[PDB]
C-alpha cells in the first residue's frame, strides 16, 4: 500500500490550493484511487487497470510511457520543462488534467469523482497519515544523525591511531 | 494568403523523404494562414493546399484531444517537419507512410512532441498540369540552359589556358616535372568521350536523391529568376 499527496491549483478557482491524494496497492499500473479535497468537501474516485489500458490504447502510446506520464503529472513528478492544467467541474463532478505545451493543450486524463458525504473522516485520515509520516521521518533522521556522529568519532580515533603508528 | 503560400512553395527547394521503403521529393511551405505541399515520386505529382478551417478540422478529426488553435498546430507542424526536409538523417521521431488511393495519396506523418503523440495526414490530390509544369519543367529547362552556358564558359577558359601553355612552350623553356603535362583541350573529343563512358552513370536519376543533393541551389536560383 502506497500513497502520495500533492497540491494543485485548479484553473476554475486560481486562488486556493486543492490537495489530491493518489493511493495504489502495489504499483500505479494496476490502478489507483484519487481523492481531491479543498479542505471542506472531498471527491473520491477510482481507476482500474482496464480503464488505464483503454486510455493508453485510445491515445496510441505504449502503456509504460503513458503510466510514466500519469505518474509525472499526478504524483508531482513534473520536471523543469513541463506544465499541467487540472480542472474539475463540480456541477458535473468531472475532473480532468491536460498537458499545456507551447500554446497547445493535450488531454492527459479524465475521471468522474463522486462527492463523499463525510469529508471530515477523509480529512482526518489524511492529516493522521501526514503526522505519522513526519514522525517516522524525524525518528529515522535522528537515528541516522546519531549513527553519523558515532562513525565520525570512530574515524577520528582510528585516524589518530594510524598517525601514531606511522610515526612510531 | 493563397498567393503568399503559392509563392513560398514555388521559392522552396525539393527535399528527400524516406518512408516505408519508399522515396519521395517534397516541397512544403507553412504559414499561419495555412500550408502548401507538393510531393513527387518521379512518376506522379500530388499537390495539397490547406487553410485554417481545413487544418483545424483535420487536426480535430485525427487528434481527438489535441485542443490547440490552428495557428499553433501549423507552427508545430512546421517546426517538426522543416528540420527533416532541410537536412536528412535528423534525430527525430517523424515516421512517415504513404497510402496510394485510386487518384489521391494519403501521406501520414506520426511524431512525438514533448513525449506525446502527434498525427497528421496530407490528402494530396494529383497536381494540375499547370502547377507541375511551372514547378518542374520550366525550372529544369532553365537549369539545363544555365549548365550549358557554364560548360561553354569553362571551355572558353580552357581554350585560353591552352593558348597560354602553347605560348609558354614556344619560348623553349620546358617543365621541371614531366608528370604535369596535360594534353590540349578539344571540345568535340572531350564531349564524345564523356558521352561514351561517363554518361550512363552521370544521368542515373535513381530515386531522386542525387537531384536534391547536387543542384538544388541552381534550381532555387532559376525559380527565383522565373518568379521575377
What are the Cα distances from residue B80, in Å, to B20, B35, B118, B119?
19, 14, 10, 12
**Distance in angstroms (rounded) separating the CA atoms of residues B195 and B189:** 10
DSSP B21-54: S-EEEEEEEEETTEEEEEEE-SS-EEEEEEEHHH
Experimental approach was: cryo-EM
A58 touches chain B (CB under 8 A): yes
- A34, A126, A49, A47: which is closest to A88 by C-alpha? A34
* C-alpha torsion A90→A91→A95→A99, nearest 10: -100
Q: Are B98 and B105 in contact (CB under 8 A)?
A: yes
Phi-psi sector, A47: left (phi>0), alpha (psi -120 to 50), beta: beta
| Edge-first strand listing for the sheet containing A83-89 | A83-89, A94-100, A105-112, B66-67
H/E run at residue B118: strand B116-126
**Distance in angstroms (rounded) separating the CA atoms of residues A13 and A18:** 10
**Distance in angstroms (rounded) separating the CA atoms of residues A79 and A73:** 9
Residues in chain B within 8 Å Cβ distance of A60: 117, 119
* C-alpha torsion B107→B112→B118→B120, nearest 10: -10
DSSP B175: -
**Distance in angstroms (rounded) separating the CA atoms of residues B181 and A23:** 86
Strands A18-24 and B15-18: unpaired
SS3 category, A20: strand
Strands (E), A57-137: 83-89, 94-100, 105-112, 114-115
- If one counts every other C-beta atom within 10 angstroms of the C-beta of residue B117, the result is 16
Angle, vertex CA B54, rays to CA B48 and CA B55, nearest 5: 85
Residue with cell 521521518: A137
- Taking the CA of residue B32 and the nearest CA in chain A, the distance in Å comes to 14
Under an 8 A CB cutoff, do A99 and B114 touch? yes
Strand partners, B38: B27, B47
Amino acid at each position: 500500500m502506497e500513497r502520495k499527496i500533492s497540491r494543485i491549483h485548479l484553473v476554475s478557482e486560481p486562488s486556493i490550493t486543492h490537495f489530491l491524494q493518489v493511493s495504489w496497492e502495489k504499483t500505479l499500473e494496476s490502478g489507483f484511487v484519487i481523492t481531491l479535497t479543498d479542505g471542506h468537501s472531498a471527491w473520491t474516485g477510482t481507476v482500474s487497470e482496464s480503464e488505464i489500458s483503454q486510455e493508453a490504447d485510445d491515445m496510441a502510446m505504449e502503456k509504460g510511457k503513458y503510466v510514466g506520464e500519469l505518474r509525472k503529472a499526478l504524483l508531482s513528478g513534473a520536471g523543469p520543462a513541463d506544465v499541467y492544467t487540472f480542472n474539475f467541474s463540480k456541477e458535473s463532478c468531472y475532473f480532468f488534467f491536460e498537458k499545456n505545451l507551447k500554446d497547445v493543450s493535450f488531454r492527459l486524463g479524465s475521471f468522474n469523482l463522486e462527492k463523499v458525504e463525510n469529508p471530515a473522516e477523509v480529512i482526518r485520515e489524511l492529516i493522521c497519515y501526514c503526522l505519522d509520516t513526519i514522525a517516522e521521518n524525524q525518528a529515522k533522521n535522528e537515528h541516522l544523525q546519531k549513527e553519523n556522529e558515532r562513525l565520525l568519532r570512530d574515524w577520528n580515533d582510528v585516524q589518530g591511531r594510524f598517525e601514531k603508528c606511522v610515526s612510531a | 494568403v493563397m498567393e503568399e503560400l503559392e509563392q513560398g512553395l514555388l521559392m522552396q527547394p525539393w527535399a528527400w523523404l524516406q518512408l516505408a521503403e519508399n522515396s519521395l521529393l517534397a516541397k512544403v511551405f507553412i504559414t499561419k494562414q495555412g500550408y502548401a505541399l507538393l510531393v513527387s515520386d518521379l512518376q506522379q505529382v500530388w499537390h495539397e493546399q490547406v487553410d485554417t478551417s481545413v487544418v483545424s478540422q483535420r487536426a480535430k478529426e485525427l487528434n481527438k484531444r489535441l485542443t490547440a488553435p490552428p495557428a499553433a498546430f501549423l507552427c508545430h507542424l512546421d517546426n517538426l517537419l522543416r528540420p527533416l526536409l532541410k537536412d536528412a538523417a535528423h534525430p527525430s521521431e517523424a515516421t512517415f507512410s504513404c497510402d496510394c488511393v485510386a487518384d489521391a495519396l494519403i501521406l501520414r506523418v506520426r511524431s512525438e512532441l514533448s513525449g506525446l503523440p502527434f498525427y497528421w495526414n496530407f490528402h494530396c490530390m494529383l497536381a494540375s498540369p499547370s502547377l507541375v509544369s511551372q514547378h518542374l519543367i520550366r525550372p529544369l529547362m532553365g537549369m539545363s540552359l544555365a549548365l550549358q552556358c557554364q560548360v561553354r564558359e569553362l571551355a572558353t577558359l580552357l581554350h585560353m589556358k591552352d593558348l597560354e601553355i602553347q605560348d609558354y612552350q614556344e619560348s623553349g623553356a620546358t617543365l621541371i616535372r614531366d608528370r604535369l603535362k596535360t594534353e590540349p583541350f578539344e571540345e568535340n573529343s572531350f564531349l564524345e568521350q564523356f558521352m561514351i563512358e561517363k554518361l550512363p552513370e552521370a544521368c542515373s536519376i535513381g530515386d531522386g536523391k542525387p537531384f536534391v543533393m547536387n543542384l538544388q541551389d541552381l534550381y532555387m536560383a532559376v525559380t527565383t529568376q522565373e518568379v521575377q
